[model samples]
Target: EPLDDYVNTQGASLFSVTKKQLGAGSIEECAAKCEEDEEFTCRAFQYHSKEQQCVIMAENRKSSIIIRMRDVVLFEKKVYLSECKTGNGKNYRGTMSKTKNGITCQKWSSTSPHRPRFSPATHPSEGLEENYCRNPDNDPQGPWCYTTDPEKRYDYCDILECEEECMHCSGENYDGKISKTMSGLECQAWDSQSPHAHGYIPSKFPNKNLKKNYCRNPDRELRPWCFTTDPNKRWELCDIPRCTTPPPSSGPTYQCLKGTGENYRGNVAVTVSGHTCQHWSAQTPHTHNRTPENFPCKNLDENYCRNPDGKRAPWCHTTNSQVRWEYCKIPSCDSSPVSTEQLAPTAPPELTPVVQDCYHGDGQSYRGTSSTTTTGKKCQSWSSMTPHRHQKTPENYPNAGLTMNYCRNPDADKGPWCFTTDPSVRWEYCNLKKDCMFGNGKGYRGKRATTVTGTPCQDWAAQEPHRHSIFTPETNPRAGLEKNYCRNPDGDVGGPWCYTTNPRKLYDYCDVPQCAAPSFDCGKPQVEPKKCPGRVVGGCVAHPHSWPWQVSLRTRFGMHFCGGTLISPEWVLTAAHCLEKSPRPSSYKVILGAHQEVNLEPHVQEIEVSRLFLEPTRKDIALLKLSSPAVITDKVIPACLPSPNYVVADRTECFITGWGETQGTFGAGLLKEAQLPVIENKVCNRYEFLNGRVQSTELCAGHLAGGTDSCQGDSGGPLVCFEKDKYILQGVTSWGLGCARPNKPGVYVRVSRFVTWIEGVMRNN
Candidate 1:
C-alpha cells in the first residue's frame, strides 16, 4: 500500500576510522584528497571539530571512513553497509530491508578477480565450485551468484558465515540514514538521489571562495533531467545578438542637373565655380531694381539651395525658380541704425529755501555808550550822564549836566552835540573830564561839603550838642520803669518807704502745732529656736571591709537614714522600711567611690532612679538611690543584686554607713560611718517593733546582743553579701528598734524579689 513498496536494489557500506589513517585535518580535506586521487572520489563529508575527526564517503561504489586525529574511545561506531545481495529468496531492498543482522552472509569480494569463500571449519563443502556461479554469458562468476536450493526451491544457498565489511554506495536510503551495524557502530551512506544524481565529480564540489557548487547533470541535454531536490538550482537561456551600422563619409559630393527657367522674367546673370547663375522674378522685364527673386544661381549643388524634398539639388532647378526669381531677393542693403530723437528732456527740480542769518543788538554800539544800533531806521538814544552838584548846593540845578541823543553811533562825529529834551533819550556824551570836576555842582550840597571837608557835616557836634542830664523828651526815664521803683528806707531821693514783712501776719503771734501721742508699739516677738534632733558625727570613715553588712544614721530632717551596698548598675540591696517612707523611686540616692565630701566629684554621677525591687515580706531590706550614674571604677562599682528567691541566714556579718547620732550620745557632729555584723531574724523580731512593718521585703542586721543599730540618714545604706574580698548587695538599712538601744537591732529591706525588672529597665534605658 505504501508508495515505495518496491525496494531499491542498491546498498552501501561504511567504516569508522581515525583522521590520522585518513591523513587529513577535516572531513572536507579528506574528501578533497579523495577527489584529487584518480582512483578515488568522494560524494560528501562531515567534520567533527571536537573530536578532530573526518567522516567522508567515497563516490558511488566506495565505502566511507570516519577518521579521528586525536585519541578517542571506540565505544560505538556506526557503519552503513549496503550492496548486500542477499543469498536468500526474500526481497532485500528499500529502508525496511536494511537489517542489523541476518543470515544472508554478505561479504566483500576479493580484489583482483578473487572470490570470497567461507572457511572449511565454519561450513562443510557442498561441492559448489567456481563455474557453478558463472553468469549467463559464461564469463566466470557474476558479482552476485546464487544457486537454487535442492531441498527447498526458494532456499538456494545457505549463509556460510556472515562477514562484516565496509562498502560504498549512494542513493536516498544511504544519503540521510545513519544506521547502526552489528558491531554496535554508527555510519552514514553517501546519497545519490535527486540532489546528487548528477554524479559526484570533482567539479561538483562547492568552491570555498565562491560558495557555489558547479554541478551539471550529464543527461541534461539528452533527457533534460533536473535536480529538483536542490533549492539553489535553476534554468536559464542565453541572450540573442544584434548588429550596428557604420557612419557616413565627411567629404562633400555633388550631382549635375539641367536648367529650367522658362517662367522667369528677371535680367541679371552671374557664374561661379563652373556654374551659371541668373535672376528670376514674378514681374516680367523688371524696371526697378530686382527683388530677391531677380537674381537666381543654377546648376549648383544643394549646398547653395535645398530642393522641395529636402534633397541636395541645383540652385536653378526649382519649379518656382522661373516664376519667382524675377528679381534678386537679397536682404535689404540696410542694417539696423542707431535710434534718433534724444530721450525726452527731464524737468529741473525745485530749489530749497536757504535759512536767513539772525541779528541781535550790536555789541560795539553799546560798548562806548548806553545805546546799541540795530538794522532798522528806528534809532535809540544813549543813556545820559548824571548832572554834577556839590554837597552844599541848593535843591535847584546847582551843577553841570550832560546831553543825550538818539543816533546810530553815539561815539561817532554826528552824535556828541545832538541833544533831546525827552527824558527817555539816552546819550553817549558826558563831560567827565570837565563838567564833573569840582565846580560842576551835580551832587548834593551835603555830599559836596562832606567831600571837601572829608566829614559828614561841618561842625555838627558844635551846632547841636547833647546836654548831659537835661530833661529832654527823648531821655525822660519815667515812661515804663514803674516796677523798678523800690521804696528806699530813708525815702529821701527815689520813693516812699515800703515794709518788708507781711502786714496781715503782724496782727497775730506765731504758735507751735499740737501733735498726737503714740497708740501701740508693733515689733517682732521673741521666740526660742529648736535645735536639730541629731548632729552629724565626725566624717565618713572608710572600712574597706567586705559586705553582708549594715549601717544606720539620722537624717537632717529627723527621719532615719540607711545604707546598703551596690548590687548592680541599676540596683542596690537595702531595707524595705527605707523605701516605705518614700516608696517612689525618685526619693533615694546612693553614694559610692568617695571617702569624703571632697572626693564626691570624682566618685559621683547622678542617675534618675526608675524602680524599687523588693521581696514580698520579711522586714529590714531596701534598695537605695545611687540615683546617679556611677562608672565602674576601682573605687565606685555596681554590686550584684541577688536574683528573686535568694536567701541568706541571719547573724552573718553585713555592712552599713550612716550620719546618725554616734553611740552613747544623741547629738553628732558630721556623718558617722561604720560597718557591723548582721543579727539573726528571730532575735530582731523578738524586739518591740512595728508589726508587719518588718515583712519579707526586709532583712534584719544589727547586734541583737546589744550596742549596735542604724539611725536616721543611714536608712538606705548597703548590707551586702560578704566574701573574702568581693561584696554583693544583699540588703539595705531600713529601720531600727530605737536608736542604738540594747537587745534591739536594725532592719533592712531584702533585695531578691525583682531581678528581671531591674535588668530589663537597665538594658532598655
Candidate 2:
C-alpha cells in the first residue's frame, strides 16, 4: 500500500469524463486539491513532474486505479485509522469523548478489543469500530479499522501514520483471492499455520528500502514483506487461475494432442500414459497433407501447421508459437507413428514410487500447506512483491547434507550467521569478514590458511602465504653474523602477519612459528621430552621451553603484570579486562623469550601491541593485534586452537602458564606452570565453590580444594589442553576467587565456542 504520489497500472485503471487542470506546483499540491474538494471521492490525483501538470481523479481506491497514467505521479487517499490515546491516562473502554461531524471519538482500552467483521461491500471498520478513534498518529478526518479475517490482521493496536504503514510487504500471490475489487487489500497478520497463510511462504522479495522482507508476517516470519497500502480488500489468492482456462491467443494452441497416422509394422511407435501407437497397416508412406483429426486412416505424412505427424503431445511437433518446448535434451520426433489406446486399466497416477507418506523428495505432500520439505528450504524462504515485475530473482541460499541449512545474509545483506538443526552441534552465530571465510577443522596448529576461494598452498606460492627465510639468530648479532634468508621448516614469515603461512589448513590458531635465522630443517625440537618432560606442580618452575607460546606481558610501568598466548607471531589472546583495567594496548609491551626470569636471550623478542578488540559484553576475552610480528624461533611458536566442536570433559587435564602476581607469590617475574583439572560448571558453581557466580562466559578449571592453580598476573595468559599431539589453547586466564584458595577456582573465557568469531575478527580487521 502506497500513499500520495505512487502510480499503479495493474488492478487499477484510469477513467475519463472528469478533468480539471487546476494549476498545481507538484504532486503533493494536486493531492491537497483532491482533499479540499468533497463533492466526490478523490481517490487519486496525478501530477506530471516533468511538465508540472496536475489532474484529479474521483476514485479513491489506488488499487481500483490500477491503470493510472504513465506520465503522471498519482496521489491517493487510502483510509487509515489514526492512533488514539487519552491525555489524562483515563481508560475509555465504553466511554465516548467528543462528537463532531456525526463521528464520536473514544479513548483506547485493551480490555475490549473492538473487532469488526468483513462485509464484501463495506469496510470491516467503517463505523465506530475504527472511525471514531482520534489520535495524533492517525487521521482526524479518517477512521481506524481492522479485519476479522485472522490472516489479514496486521497490528491493529500499533497506531502509527497509516501512509507509512501501507505499501509494506503483503503476502504470497494467489489467483482469485483478489481478482478484482473496488476496495483495496488490507494488511493481514496471518500465522503460517492458518488456513489462508498455510502453503504461503512469504518470499523475502526485495522492497525499496524496506526494513523487512516482502510479505513476511511480522508475527510469523522475521523478514520484510510487500504490502499494498490498501486496507479494504485482499490482493492475493491461493489457486492458480491461469492454469484452469485455455491460455490467451498468445498461448500454446500448438500443444501435442496424440498423433494417429504411422508407418509401423505391428511395433508400437508412439506410446505414452498407458496408450500405445502401433502401426497395424503396411509400411508405406505418402506425401499428402493431413492433420491429427484425420490421422492414421489417411496414412499420410504432412507437415501441416508445421507439426510432425503421429507423435505424442508436447514432444510431438510444435507450430508457430515456437515455444512450450523448454529443453532438457528432448528427443526429435522423426517417425510418423500413430497412437493406440492400451485397452486395459492404466496404472493409477500413484504408480510412480513415492514415500509411504505419498511425498516425493522432501515432505511436499499432496495435501496443502507450504512447509520446507527435506529438500533444504525452510519456512523462512521469501520472494518479490511488485505486480507484473520484470528482472527479479530470489537470493541464493547455501545448503548441504548434515549442514543443510543457511542464513539469509549473503548477497542482500551479506552478514554472517552460524547454526545447526542438530543441537549437540552448538549452532553459533558469527560475523562476515571480507578477506577469509573462516573454515574449521581438527588441527591443533590451528591455523588452516587458504584464500577466500578455498585455494591452497602447494608450497610458498600465489594466494598461499608463508615464505620462510633466515635472517640471523638475533636482531642484535655480534659481528659478521649471517642475516641471509634460510629454510626454517617451523617458522612462518608472512603478513598480514600473525596468520598461517601454510595453506589448505584449518585456521584454528594465529601463532605461526618464527624459527631461528639460518633456518635448519635439521634443527631438533627445542627440548627432548626426556629432559624437561611433562610436569607442572602448583607454581612449579617450568622448563625454559615447555610452554614456548607463553608470553609475559610487560606493562607500561616497566612492570611484568599479566600474561598472553602467542596466536600468530603478531597477535596474542588475553582477557579484555586486562587491557581495560590495566591501561591500554600500548601499555602491554610483550616479551616472548624469558621463561624463569634468569633467562636472557639473543633468542628473545620484545614487542608492542598496535591494536585490540574486546568482546562487547564479556570482560575477559580479547585479541591483541601486534604492531610488528615477532622473530620466530624453535623457542617461540604458536599454540593451536581447540578442535572444532570440542567439549572438554569434566576433570580434564589442563595447564595454566603465567608469571605470578598472587599475594602468596608476589612479583614472581619468572614464568610459572600449574597443573589442574577442569571442574564442571555444575560442580564449580556450587556454594562451596563460587556460590553460583560462575557465568556462561567463564569456565572453571581448578579443584575446590585448590592447590595447584594459576595466580593473579596470569590474567591474559593461556589455559591450554594437550590434544591431537599439540597444545591447543582452550581459554584465557580471566579471573579467580582471589589467588587460588580452598574452594577458589580460576575462571577463564571459553575459546572453543568462539572459533568463527575469532577468525572473522582477524579477517575483517
Candidate 3:
C-alpha cells in the first residue's frame, strides 16, 4: 500500500532530483535526465540557472510528488518549465536568443484564484493603533460587553447617573400634593427618600410644616395665626434690611449763574426774582441768613426771594406786590434851521399901456379915409406916408393909440383910423357903392355917380396888378385837356391827350414832334405823320423770304428761349451760333412772329424751343428743338432751306431777315429785309477781313453798296434763298460787317450742311 510503488510503476519521477550544477542545464536537459532514470517521465522542468538550480516536473504519475519536503527533496510536485536553455550550445538553447545577452526564466504555474471569505465573527483585527472602529459593538479589541454587578462592572458615573435620575423622576407631582394636603398634616411628606439612601435630608427641605407667613427669609419662623408683621416685637429673622436714604441738601449760595434767573437749585429756599442762584464752592460762606428778613426785592410780583448777591436759605420770604410805571425814552429831533438864502422872490403883476399918435402929411389934422374912397382931404398917399408911419413912436402918439383895420366887419370901412373911446360911437364909412364918399368928410352927397375923366379907368386898370385869375384850367376844363395843357412848357410829354374835336380818341402826343410820327424813317429828317396814325402798331414783321414763326429753345427743366423757324413753322430751325454754348434760357429774347416793336400781336400760336440739336463738327448750323406745335398762317410763314443732299451753285440770290441796324446806329426802327447774292466760299473768304477759312457749314453775302451791311445784335436771323418760287432759309445771318462795309461779306450759318445731324439729335432729344 505504500505510495512509492505507485510512483515507480507509472514511469513518473518518484525521487527526481535536480542538481545545483550540471553546467547550467535547461528544462529539456532536466527532462532528459529524468527519462534516463527509467522509472521517471518528466513532462516539464523549471530551471534557475543563476542559482545553478533546476526543478524536475512530471505529469500523470502514479505517485505524485510529495511537495512537503522542507528544503531539498528527491521528489516534488510537478512544476511547469518555460523559456529554458540546453547545456550544449547557444543555438540549441530554447527559443530565447542567448547571444543577445538578456535574462530568462522558466514559466511558473498560477496561484490559487479564489479569495478567503470573512464573517463578523472572523473579521480581521483592526488594531488599537488603527483607531478605525471606535463604537463599542465594533471594537476590534473585543466586544464591549457590560454587566450590572457593581464589583465586576465600570460605569461612567458622570454621564449615566444623571441620565438615569432624570428618566425616573421627571413626571412626579410635588406641587399638587402640597396644595391638597391637610393644613397640619406635616409637609414632610413632600420630601422624598434620597437616591443615595444615606439617611441625610436635602438642606432645601429642612422645615416640615408651613407657618403661612409672607416673609421672604427662609430661616424665619412665624406664628400660625398672623399674616402681618408684629411691630410691637423686635423680630430677629423676620425683617429684611433696606437701603439707607441720605438727608436733605443745604440751600444754594448766591452767585451769577449763567447770566439768567431760572438757574436756581436749592431746598426750602426762595429764589431771587432777578438775580440767578448757583451752587457756590463749599469754602464760600452763605450771604443771606435762614430768615425771611434777609430776602431782597427784585421788582417782580412773584415772591421769589434771595440775597442781593443771589444767595438764599430756608424761611426767607418775599411779598408779591408790583408797581406800575411808564418807561419812556426820549425821541430824537433834527435841530437844523431853514435858511433865507434858498427862498425865491415873487414878481409884480400887470404891464403898463403905451401911447401913440396918428400922423398926416405936414402935421395937418386929417380924418380917417376908407379903402373904397380915392380922395381923403388929400392928406397923404400910402406910398408917401409909409415911412412916417414906420418912424412914428409911442411918444409921438399923445391921445391916439395904434389902430388895426377891421376888414372882417361888413359896416366897417377897410382902413386904419384913431381908436374911439366907445366902440358904439366909432364911425366908419359904408363900403357899399351907393353911399360912397370921395373924401374923409361925414357928408353923404346926393349921388352924382360921375366917372372920373382925367385918366380913364382903362389906364388905371392896366396900371393895377390884376388879381391872379382864379379860374385854373385844372378846376374849369376837363381832366385830359387840363393835364395836356398844364404840363410845364419846358418838360417832356410822352402819353395820350384828348383834342376837343375828338374827345373820345386818346392821342399820344410827344414833346418832340418827330417822336409822334406813325413811321420813323431815320434816313430822312423825322416828321410827324400828316394825320395821327390810328393806333400803335406791333413789332417787326418778317418778310416773305424770312421766318415769320418763333420757336422757344427750351431745356429739360421747362426753361425756354425765343428762336425762329428756318423752313416751316412746323420744321423750326435757328442759328447754329445761338446753340454753340450752353445759352441760358432766361437771356433769350426774340421778337419773331410779330409785327410791332412795342405792341407785339403774335400770330395765333406760340412754340417754345425744347431741345438744341447741334451738328457735331459744324459750329454754324443748329436746328431749333420745339416743345409745342405752331399754327401756320399766311403772316406766320416759314422759309425753306436747300437740302443737305442737294448742291446749290454759287452766286445765288438770297435775302436776309432781321430787325437789325438800318444805318449802323442805335435807334427804334422798323424791321427791314434785303436781297443779296450768295458768293462762293473761295471768293467770300478771300477778302482781307474774312480770310480763306470758310467751311461747308458757313455761307456769306454782302451788299454792293458800301457801309450797308448788318451790324451788331443781328445774330440768328434768316438768310433766305428764293428757290423754285419758294422762300428757302438757306443760312442764318450769324455774323456781319460794321454797317455794310465794301468787301466784307455778311457771314451766315448754312443750315443745309447740318441737316442729317440736326435730324438725328432732334429725334433723340
Among the numbered candidates, top TM-score falls to 2
N/CA/C clash count, model 1: 145
Candidate 3 deviant stretches above 4 angstroms: 1-563, 566-570, 576-579, 583-592, 596-598, 602-607, 610-613, 640-642, 649-652, 664-666, 680-697, 703-718, 735-738, 761-765
lDDT accuracy of residue 396 in candidate 2: 18
Q: Looking at model 2, which ten-residue stretch has the lowest summed lDDT? A: 342-351
Candidate 2 residue-wise lDDT at 418: 29
Candidate 1: segments with Cα more than 4 A from true spot? 1-564, 573-603, 606-629, 644-646, 649-652, 663-697, 735-738, 753-765
Q: Compared with the true structure, what per-residue lDDT tens digits does model 3 show for residues 1-765? A: 111111111111223333222222233333344435543333333332322234554431222332211122234221211111122211111112111122122121111122312221232221111111112222222211121121421122111111111111121111111111112222112123322111212211222222222222222223111112222221222222232222111212223332323233322232334222233222145453343333333332243322333222212322222311111112334123221111111111111112112212221111211212222221222112222212222222211111332111121122332212221222222222232221211121212221212111111112122111222334323212122121211111111111112111112121222123211110111111111111111112334322343322223442322234534433445654344676444333333354323334555344444444456774645556444444555444444433443333344445554444445444554454445564422333233445545553455654334223233334455444443222334555564324444455545665444555654444532
Off by over 4 Å in 2: 1-526, 530-537, 581-585, 596-602, 642-644, 661-667, 686-691, 735-740, 752-757
RMSD to native, candidate 2: 30.3
What tens digits encode model 2's per-residue C-alpha lDDT throughout 1-765? 124223233112254345555443222333445457644444355544322234565443322323311233344332221122333312111112222122233223222335333222243223223223322223332223332222432232332221222122122211112222123343443333222312222222222222222322223222222322343222332111122221111111222333332332221223223232212131234322333555434332332122243333222322222333421122455444332311111111221222234233322111111111121111222232122221222221112111223232212110122222231221222233222211111221233334223333233222223222222224213212122112212222111121223332222122222233221222223332322212333453545565566566555543555666666645557655446554333454556655644344656766556454565444566666556666666665555342333444444456666666334554444665666675532343333444545454456566544554556546566666544233455666664224545545555776545656654454422
How would you encode candidate 1's per-residue C-alpha lDDT over 209-314 as one tens digit per residue? Answer: 1112222222122211112232322222111122222211111222222222222222323223333333333235543333343335433232233222222122
What does candidate 1 score on TM?
A: 0.23
lDDT of every model, 2 decimals: 0.30, 0.37, 0.30
lDDT winner between candidates 2 and 3:
2
